[PDB]
Design a protein around this ligand. Sequence first.
Ligand SMILES: Nc1ncnc2c1ncn2[C@@H]1O[C@H](CSCC[C@H](N)C(=O)O)[C@@H](O)[C@H]1O
Ligand SMILES: [Mg+2]
Length: 779
Amino acid sequence: HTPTPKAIIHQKFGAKASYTVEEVHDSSQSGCPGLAIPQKGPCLYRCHLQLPEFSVVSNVFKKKKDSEQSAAELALDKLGIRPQNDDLTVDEARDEIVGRIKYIFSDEFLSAEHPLGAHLRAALRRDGERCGSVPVSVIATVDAKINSRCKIINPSVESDPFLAISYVMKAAAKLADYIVASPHGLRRKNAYPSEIVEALATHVSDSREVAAVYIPCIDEEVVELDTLYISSNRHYLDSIAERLGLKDGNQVMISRMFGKASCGSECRLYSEIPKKYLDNSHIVKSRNARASYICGQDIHGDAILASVGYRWKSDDLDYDDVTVNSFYRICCGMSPNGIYKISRQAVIAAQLPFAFTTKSNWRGPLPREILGLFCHQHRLAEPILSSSTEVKIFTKSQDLVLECSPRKFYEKENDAIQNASLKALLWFSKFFADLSSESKNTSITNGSVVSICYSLSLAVDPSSVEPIESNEEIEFEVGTGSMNPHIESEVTQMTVGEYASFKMTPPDAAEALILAVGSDTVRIRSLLSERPCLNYNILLLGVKGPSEERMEAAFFKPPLSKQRVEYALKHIRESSASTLVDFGCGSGSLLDSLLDYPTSLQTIIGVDISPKGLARAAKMLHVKLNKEACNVKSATLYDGSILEFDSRLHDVDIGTCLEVIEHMEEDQACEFGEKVLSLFHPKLLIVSTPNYEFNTILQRSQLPKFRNHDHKFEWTREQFNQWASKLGKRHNYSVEFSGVGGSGEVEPGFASQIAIFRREASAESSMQPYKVIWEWKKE
RNA sequence: GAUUUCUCUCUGCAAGCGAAAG
RNA sequence: UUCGCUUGCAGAGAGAAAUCAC
Ligand SMILES: Nc1ncnc2c1ncn2[C@@H]1O[C@H](CSCC[C@H](N)C(=O)O)[C@@H](O)[C@H]1O
Ligand SMILES: [Mg+2]
């Protein structure tokens, strides 16, 4: 385990080197002088680390988090990688161990917070000769110092736990100065000074029972509930020992911790210690199959599965009631299909799907998560996921145990990752077996989700009818085998509102699963000896059709938008002019295309109310006017509302307003018309807004049948034509209609309407509401 | 227990890119 | 304007790890 974060390293040298995050830019965005707008792009970071002497700085970084490491990275490479490089000399681990123990049985330590303190303190309360003796297993387990050292002296400790006990004893013998090995554990040589212990008893901060499990090594034997009792006068281990038949707790062994996700409590497996490492007839005991699986360590003889231990600033014992069904849960919790079931809270109801749709059609824990959780509990390294332009590898201690690669490259980081993670999970699921006839009592598409309410009961095939798994609401992906098959086939017939039921004479649920779900296990065990059937009762609550991925497509050969620009460009060259206005210049596409070709225009102007849009445009104009601007001499962009008059724009010859009107109110459309024609006097004006009747063709793949979630309205060819001509006549303009898209002949009409207002006739004050956000004039 | 590191998910927000019935 | 993709920031929630005055 080398996760050596430069950061933690600094914690070893006190909170003396302060970090400061500073935000700087990397010129990764277009440089545009003069713009009064601000495109707040991602800023990169670099960290400041003030260590006593000198201070170090990280160079540019994308992640605030990476930089802080980077500062610690440059702080330690300048020192000589002095803290990371330090590792243990084998014999030096014995010194740590030795010196550590010595400190533990020292006077002062007796009143320490560290779990040991309660253990050591508790050891004084042990009856008879057992007094003052802490059991070996505790000196090795509770304290990680001993473990970190023990691991270095021997990795074989992980597989064989009795080894840490022998190293503990041997270190105790070499340092016999205040440590005496007793048939009852380790004990101090001399009495704790009377005052220290009295001082201790004054401040103590004061018959409980903790149900656990009893695991036999004899396969035939049943695993049963064995409730152990803890008393303030006896170390909890003696209580466990007492149940395994032994005489001391000094005999008790302790496995690593496990099963938090499976059972919900931190567990240990207490078994006995072959008298060989203790004295440090001779008939070793039978290996305990079950016990060994659960904890991933080899254990002998019977064992006790329990969740007990001392916490920190407390003398109080912490525990949880492990029960018979906690045990079965822990097993099912080892397979991936099982982990999924437990994570989903419906073991008999769910199943680990075989395929991945979209992260919106899935249900329960992601293949990736349930995978990583799987490896860590399995004594393995986080799975390495390879993305190419998917390939997932499994690593455990430098050894490769699984390598996978999926053929389809879904268009998403997560999705390709999740699909590979399922294949992997299916494989491991093949190592432990999991995944009959039916009778019934009272059209759905793959890629849909059903919300059922199901109820399961175990009873004798006809005090015998007992509920096992109930559930009010759960959603299931349909067609990915994400639920028990019988319930799936049953449901795909049902329609919303129905309650169907059926039973399995031969229970389809592997008993380990039935036992994992059911609380009164004693009654469940009985029913399983006689003909037991499993009753399913489903009520359908809702459904949701197939997924929606196919979202966008190109319909018109040249894309609609460009034809619209082209069309308006034709009018600009056909009638030659000077000044042009762009009421609603999005990001400058009209102006983009317009400055790509030598056009007899003199000065351009864009007006828009969108700051995010005016920014993209000014940058484009900056680059476009740099190539030889064939004819322009004063480009300008105003952040303003076209529904407003600004004296700065006068003498407009050509006037563009490409489909903006439809983006505002129907009166705002009229008011805009009114002002543009009357106040600005454009010699020519081009307005576009799509023909509404066309939307019926595009649907084939405020109002119904609308294009944007922004359009306030949409017009028919007759609606537009009317508004258009009313405004025209009332202001002396010549109006002609045409569109882009299809053609004026084919009945649908044009896909987008266009009205060309022409001044036939060919009262002002100053007010500058707008705000010049960008300007430019050849000098 | 103090502290701290690293992850993943959720929602919020910003930006870059691409496209379109804008 | 609108949608989709990618990345950075904040907050919340779950999870793993490590050190702690001899
Ligand atoms: N009242 C108003 N004043 C000015 N601009 C407006 C406005 N209401 C909407 N707009 C602008 O109208 C634009 C509509 S979409 C832009 C289409 C443009 N013809 C192109 O093809 O690039 C948006 O950029 C929006 O900011
Ligand atoms: Mg529009």
